[model samples]
Target: ENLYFQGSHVYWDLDIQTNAVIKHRGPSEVLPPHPEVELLRSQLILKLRQHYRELCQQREGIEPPRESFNRWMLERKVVDKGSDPLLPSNCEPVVSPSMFREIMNDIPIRLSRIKFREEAKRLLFKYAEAARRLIESRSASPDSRKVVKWNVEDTFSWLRKDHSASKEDYMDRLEHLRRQCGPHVSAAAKDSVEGICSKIYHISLEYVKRIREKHLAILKENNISEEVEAPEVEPRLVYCYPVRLAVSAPPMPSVEMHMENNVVCIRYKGEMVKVSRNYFSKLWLLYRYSCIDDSAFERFLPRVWCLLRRYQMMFQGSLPVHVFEALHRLFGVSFECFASPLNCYFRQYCSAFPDTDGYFGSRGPCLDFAPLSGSFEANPPFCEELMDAMVSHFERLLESSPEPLSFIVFIPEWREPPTPALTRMEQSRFKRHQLILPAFEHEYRSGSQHICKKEEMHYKAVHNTAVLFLQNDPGFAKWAPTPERLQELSAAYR
Candidate 1:
C-alpha cells in the first residue's frame, strides 16, 4: 500500500489523541514587536492623523473648536509627566501646514491600510533621524544658547509693543502661550521652556520701572508751581457705571440769582445757595453760548450741576450731524465702529462704555464684534494700541469675507516717524481711497457738549486727520465715494 493510503495505519501507530493540551503562552513569546513600543507608535500615528485632519479643516477656512486637539491629547494622557517618551523636545521643529502637507504627499496610497501605515512609519523615522542630527549639530555650537535668548527677547518685545498694556496683560498673554504649548511636550520640558516667560516678566517689570523714573524726572524738570502743575493723564475709562442717587431729593423752589459780598448766590424759596467763582464763570460762558435763555434759565439751572459733573472728564469727541449725513449720503455708511451713546449720530453704533439707559442699537466694544457685511464709519480714540488693534481687526474681517464690506476709517495723521497702523492701512490691498484733512481745517463735536461754549462745540482738531476707505471689490464698486463728493463732504466740515 502507498504511504498516502496508510495514514489510518500511521495514526493508529502514533496513538494520536483527538484533543491535545494547549500551552497558554504570553504575548511576548508570540508577538514580533514589543507591546509597549508598538502602543506608543500607534498613539503617535493617531495624533499625527488628528493634526492633519485639523490642518485640512483650517485650510478650508473651517476651524475646529478652540484648543480641542490639544485638549484631546491631554485627556488621552499622551503628554505630561509619567507619559510615554516622545520625540526629543530639542528636535521638535515648528513646521507650517503646507510643509507638513508636502512631506505627507510622498507616501503612495490607493488607500491600502497596511501600506499607508508602513509609509507613514518610514517617513516619521526618517524625520526623527534628521531631527536627531539637528539636535547634535545644535548642541555642538554655543551659538544655540543665544537662539533661545533671542526668542525670549523677541517675545518680550511683542508683549511690550502696546504702550497701554499693563503687567496683568503680560501675565495673561504668557499664561495663554503656556496653555497652547502644554500638550506638545512633557511637563518637565514645558516648565523649562516657559522659564523664558518668567525671564520676560522680570525684564518687563524693570523696563516699566525705568520708564516711570524717566517720566517722573521729566515732570520734575517741567514743574513750576502747584497751581501750574501738569495735568495728570488719566487712564482710559472703558465703562460708565450708574451714578448713585442720594436717599432724598433736594428741595427745589422759586429760583432767584444775586451777588452777595462779591460772591454769586442762588436763592431758591427760603434757601440761600452759595455759588463758587468757578460756577459763575461756567454760567457766564453758558450765557455767551446762548444755552441760558432768560425763560429757560430756571429749568436749566436745576440740571447744570449734574451736567457739568458728567462732562468734566470727557476725553473723546464726535463728528457733527452734517458730516455724518454727508458720509452716509456719499458712502452708504450706516454703522459707527466707535461711538458713545451721548454723542453718536448713527442709530447703529458701538460704544466703549455701556450705556446706563440701555440705548437701542448700542453694540458693545467694537473689538469684540465680528462684522459680517456693512459700511462702517470708525473714528476711534486716538490711542496707539487701540488704533493698531482696530486696523488688525479690520484686516482680519476683510480677509474673512467675500461680501460687500467697507470701512470709512478716520485716524489722526501721526508722523513722528508715522503710525505703524496708518502705514499698514495705506499699504493694504483693500485701501480704495485716502484723504488728509489738515489740522484746524475741520471740526468735530466737542466731547464736553453739555458744558462747552458754543464755539467750543465745534472743536477744532489739533492734528491732521487721515480718512481711509477700506473696501472689498464689490463694496468699492457699490459705494465708492467720488473725489468730487468727498470734496463736497470735506467742505461741509467747515
Candidate 2:
C-alpha cells in the first residue's frame, strides 16, 4: 500500500483513499532518542546537582552536620555540663529537608526537557544540511578542486631593506590577493592571507622602532648636538622576504690598490682617491673589522637572521619547565605542536611556519605536520585566526587517525561572548576535560626570552588560561588525567 507520512508521527494509506485509514505511531517511534541528545540530558542533570548544592550552601552557610541528637545523649550532656561538650557547635542547619524539596521542585521548569530536545534536533538538522551542501558543492565545482598557490616572491617584493613598506604599497598588495584568487576566495584562504599580512606589517613596524631607538642612542653616545641635522637615510627597495634563502652578504664591489708619487691610492668602481699611508691603513682596518672573517658566517648568519625574524613575527610566551614536566608526566606528551628551538620542551617540535627551514629539530608548521600517533602539547599563539586554524587542523587529524592520538591544549579563556575558536574546541566530541586557571595565577617564560637576559625571562599570564584535554578512547585509557593528578599539575604551575 502507498503510504503518505506527516509530522513523523502519523501516516495514511493512499491506496485505500480514506481518512479512517490514517495510522498514528507510538511516541517512542515518532521521536526516537539520540545518543548525543541523551548525553546533553546527562550534562543537564549534573548541572542541576551543582545548582542544588549551591542552594543548600547558601541557606545553611556550611555543610550538613555529621552528628545526630538522642534523648540519652542530651541528658548525659546536660548532667556533665561542667565538663567540655561532646557535640560540635553550629550543628543547627537552616536548610531543612522540606525546604530543599520545595527549591528542587522549582528547577524542572527552568531546565525543561522538551526545550533541550527541540534545540538539539534543530542543531542536528542544521549542521547535517550544511554538511550535505558542502559535499555537493565540492563535487560539482572544478575550481574547488584546483589548489590556490601563493606567489611568495612577488608577494614580498615590496618589503624594503630596512623592513618598511609604503602605505599605498601595502594596501595594493593586499588588494592583489582578491585579483589573484578571483571574485570568491574561500574563508580559510582569506584568513591565511590576512594573518600573514598582519604578521609582516607588525614585524616591519617593530624593526623600524628598534632602528630609530638605536640611532638616537648612538648620537647620545657621541655627544652630538641636537642642533646638527641628523643623517637621513631612506629604506632601499630590496627583496627581503623568504629570509632563509638569503645565504650570504651581497658580493663586494670591485677594488684595486696602487701606489703613485709616495701616496696610497684606492681605485673603486673606476674612480680613484689618494690619501696618506696612515689614513689608508686606518680605513683598511675599519673595513676588515666590519666584514666576516670566515666561511662559517655564510652558513650560520642566515639561519640566525631567519630565527630572529621569526622570533619577532610569532612571539608566543612559553610555559615553565616544571609545568611542561607536569604535563609530560600526566599526559605522556612527547611532542610540542607549537614551539621554537629556544622554548621547545621536547627534542622534536614544530617551529613557526617561516623559520622551519633553518631551525634544527623542527617538525615544520604544526598545521602541516600529520603524525600517525602521539600525545602532543599545544600552546599556540593567541591570534584568533591562528587559533581557529589550529582547532580545524586538530579536528582533521583526530578524524583521520586510526591509532591513538591526544592533545593537551593551553589557550586563553576569552569571553564577552566567547571566542569562536574556544567555542568550537569545547564542542569537539574528542574533548575529554577542560580546566580554567584564573588570571595572574600562572606564569610563562617571556616570548622574547630568546633575546632577553636571564634576569628578564619570567612572565605572568594576564588573561585567564584554559587547558583542554582532547583524546581518542585509546589515548584516554593510556594516559588518564585524574582529578588528583590535575591538582598536582596545578601545584606545579606555581
Candidate 3:
C-alpha cells in the first residue's frame, strides 16, 4: 500500500496470510552478488513490473501516453535460482511459497555444508598451524633469519623517495616505496623494513578510513540470525533479529606488496583477497578516522563466516587456524568435517572435560563426550582427509545400504521464482526478491513462538542423513523397548 525507508533499508507490512508482518535485507559482500540471489530477484521483479505497466498501458489505451500503474510492495518473496554454494546444486526457482520458506529450505543444507566445511578447514589449517609453529620456533632460534643492524637513516633512505607531490601524486609516488626495499626485503634486514612498513600501513589505513566513512551507511533492521561465515568470498551479514555479530578475522592478513608478510608472517600469493579481514580493517580504520566506536568488532567476526557461501568464493580450506579446535564442542559442526561453534564452546569449558588416565577422545553421546574427547579429537583437524575417506566410505556404504535418503536440512529453502507487486520499500529487501514468501518466515504470526524458536536453532534435531527403510529392521521406538521384556513374556508363556 504505502512505501517508505526506515534506515538504509526498506520495510513493508504485507498480507502474510491476512496478518501484517515485516522483514529486511541482508548485508553487502562484493561487486556482484557472489551468491547472485539479489540480482536474480531484482531481474524477476523488473519482469513482473514491466508486465504490469504493459497491462496498464493496454487498459488505458495509450491516451497520448501510457499510464504508470501502481506497484505493490510485498515482503514475501519466491524466486527461481540458487545463490549460495551450500544450497543444493540443483536448487530450482521458487514461485508459490512464502519468502521465508523459500530461503529456510536452504538453511539446513547450508548449515550441514557449514559443518562439512568446518571439518574440512580444521584438517587443512591444522597443517598450516603446525607449519606456523615449526616456522616460528625455527625462526626464533639463533640462525633462522639473518640478524642485521641498521640505523634509522637506512629506514628513511629505504622508504623516502624524493617527492613533494599532489594528493593523487602522493599516492602515485607512494607506489615507488612498495618496491624500493624489494632487494633489502629479501635480505634478513627486512625485519626493520617490516617494522617501518607497519608505520606506512597505519598511514595508508588512515586515508582508506576517510574514504569509507564519507559514503557508508549501515542499515540495522529486524533481527534473525543466519550463518554468514560460510565462505571466503561471501558478504558479512547483519541481522535485525537476535543481536549477535560474528566476524571472521584473517588468521594472517598480508600487505599490499610483499611488505605485509613480515607483519603477520603469513605468506600470500597476492591474488587472493580476504574480505573478512578487509571488512574488519575497513570498519576499524573508518571508525578511527571518524572517531566513533569500536564495540562491534567481536560481533562482526563470526558473521563474516556465515555469509561466505554467498560469494561462491569456495571456502573449504581457508579458515583461520584457531577454528580447527572448535569443531568437537558441537556448535553443531561435523566432527567428521568442518568448524562449528560447538567445538569452541567445548574448548571453552575444557577444564570440565579434561582428558585423563588415557581416555583419549571425548566419550559418551557426542554431547557428553564433548568434554572428554573434544580437545583431543584432532587438533590437526583431519576433516578434509576424513572427507576424502568418507566420500569413498559413503559410496561403498550407499552401495550396500537399503537406498538413498533425502531430507530437509536448511530452515529456509532456496529461491524458486519471482512473483508480482512490490513497492519501492519492498524493492530493497529480500522479500522484494521473492514471488511468494516461504513458510519459515510464516511463524512470526500465528502466535507460535515455538516455530520461530525452532527456526532459530542452528542445528538439526535428529541426524540429517536420509535412507530408504527396508521395513524389516526395527524402528528406533521398536528397537529401544523398555516394556514387554522377553524374560517377562517367557514367564507369561510358561
Candidate 4:
C-alpha cells in the first residue's frame, strides 16, 4: 500500500491475509550513501580468510591443498547463501584460489602485508610438516636421525608462546633501528594521516643493515677476507602502502534444515515436509556415512515415513500399484484411501484399522476431520456430492489450522465440476493449484471392468481424470507437478 502526503510518499504494507510484509521505493526517491558498508565488507573478508586458514592449519587431518580447499569452501558458501535469507548477496567476499590468482596476475597493484603474511604462514606451515615427515621416514636404524624422537612439549613450544623475545628487548631493538636509519626512513614514513605502518618497515630495514655491519667488522677483526652477509629481516608486522587486503564474510549457513518443537522439516521441490527430527537425522547419517550404489538404507525412506504419519484416505477406484507408485514418485506421496487388507503394506489403511484411520466414509463423513499438522493424499469415489463435501471440509481445515496442512486430491471427470468455492480476499483460507494441461487423461480399470482375467492383478485407468493439489502453506509454487511432468511420470510408471 502507498500513501501520499503533502509532498513525499510512504509505500509500505502488511498483507494480513497472505501474511506478507512488503516495502517499496519510488524512482525519484534518493537516499544517503553509506560509508559504513566498506568497513563491514572488509571486516567480513578478513573473517573468511582467517577461518579458511585455520581449517587448513589445524592438525585434525590432512585436507585438500589450498586450491581445492578454497573451491570446497566456496561451494559450501554457495549452498549456505542459497539457504539463508539474512546473508545478502553482492558482498560475499571469499578469498579463493581464483581471487588470489587474479590479484597475482594484475600489475601496478601490490599485495597488502596483512594478506601476504597470512599466505607466508600458510606456505611455511605446510612445507614444515612435509619436511619433518620426510626426515622421520628416511631411516629406522638405532641411533639414526630418522629415529629421532621429538618431545611433544618441545615440538609445540615455538608454535605457541613459551619463547618469544621479551617486549623490552623488542622495543629496545626498534629504538636502535630508528636511530640507525635516521632521515630517509622517517621521510618515507610521513603520511597525510597514516604514516605509522611505513615507519615500522623503515625501522626493520635499518635493523637488518646494523647486523650486516657487525658481521663485516667481526670478519675483519679475525683477519678473514670472506664476505660477511646478513640474512633478510621480515618484520613480524608489515605495511603495504596503496594496497588493500580484501576477504569476504562467509555466507550464512543455508537453511537446509529447520525445526519447531521436536518436529523437523525439509524442503523438497520447494515444498516443506514435516518429519520427526530424530529419525530424519538418522536417515541422512546412514546414507552420508557410506555406500553409494545402495546405502544400507533406502534414500526415500525419510520421505515415505513422513507421508505415513499423514496417512488419510484414498479413492474406491484405487489406482493400481504401477500408477500409485508413479503418483508417489511424481509428488512424494501415495494414495492410502482405498487400499484393502491384502495390500495394506504400511498398515495405514482405513479398511485394516477403520476405527483409527482417515478414509472418507469409513467412519461416517470424515470431511471435517483435522489434525494439528499433517499431509494427506485424497482420491475420492469420484462422486459429485462427496467431492463437494471434501472440498468444503478442506476449506475449513485451511481456515482453522494454526500451522500448515498439505492435501493432494485426484478429482473425477464431470461436465460441470463444481469450481472449488473460495474467496480471493481470504487468501489464508487455502491455496489452489492448477495445470496448463486439463485433467490428466488416463484409463482406469474400474472394479466392474478389466481387460485381463481375474488371474492377473492390475488396475488401469479406463477414462481421463483430473488431479487437484491444495495446501495451506506458503510458497507452494513448486509443490504441484507440471502437466508435462505428470504425463511423463504416469507413462514411465505405466
Q: Candidate 3 regions off by >4 Å?
A: 1-188, 195-200, 207-243, 246-494
Tens digit per residue, CA lDDT, model 4, 268-303: 334354544443443343223222322343323332
Ranking by TM-score: 2, 1, 4, 3
- For model 3, how does the per-residue alpha-carbon lDDT over 1-494 read when each residue is reduced to its tens digit? 44231111111111111110112223222111111232232333344445433432332222111111110111110111222211111122222122223222221111122234335333223322322332233224333322211222333343345334334443332234223422322333233223332332233234333322321211112222234754454333221111112321122122232213111111123222233222223323322222111244432322222222222121111111122222212121222212222122121111111111001111111111111111121121112222233233222322332322111011122213311111211332111011222342222111111112223323222211111111111211222212343233222211
TM-score, prediction 3: 0.16
Q: Per-candidate RMSD vs. true structure?
A: 34.7, 36.7, 29.7, 33.8
User: For candidate 1, lDDT tens digit of each residue in 380-476?
Assistant: 8655556777889899988977667789899887557777888989999999999888998877877654333445566788888889999988778
Top candidate on TM-score is 2
Candidate 2's C-alpha runs over 4 A off are 1-298, 310-315, 354-358
Range of the 10 consecutive residues with the lowest summed lDDT in candidate 1: 11-20
Q: Judged by TM-score relative to the true structure, which candidate is superior, 1 or 3? A: 1
The reply for model 4, stretches above 4 Å from the true place, is 1-316, 334-346, 349-365, 402-404, 415-432, 435-441, 445-462, 474-494
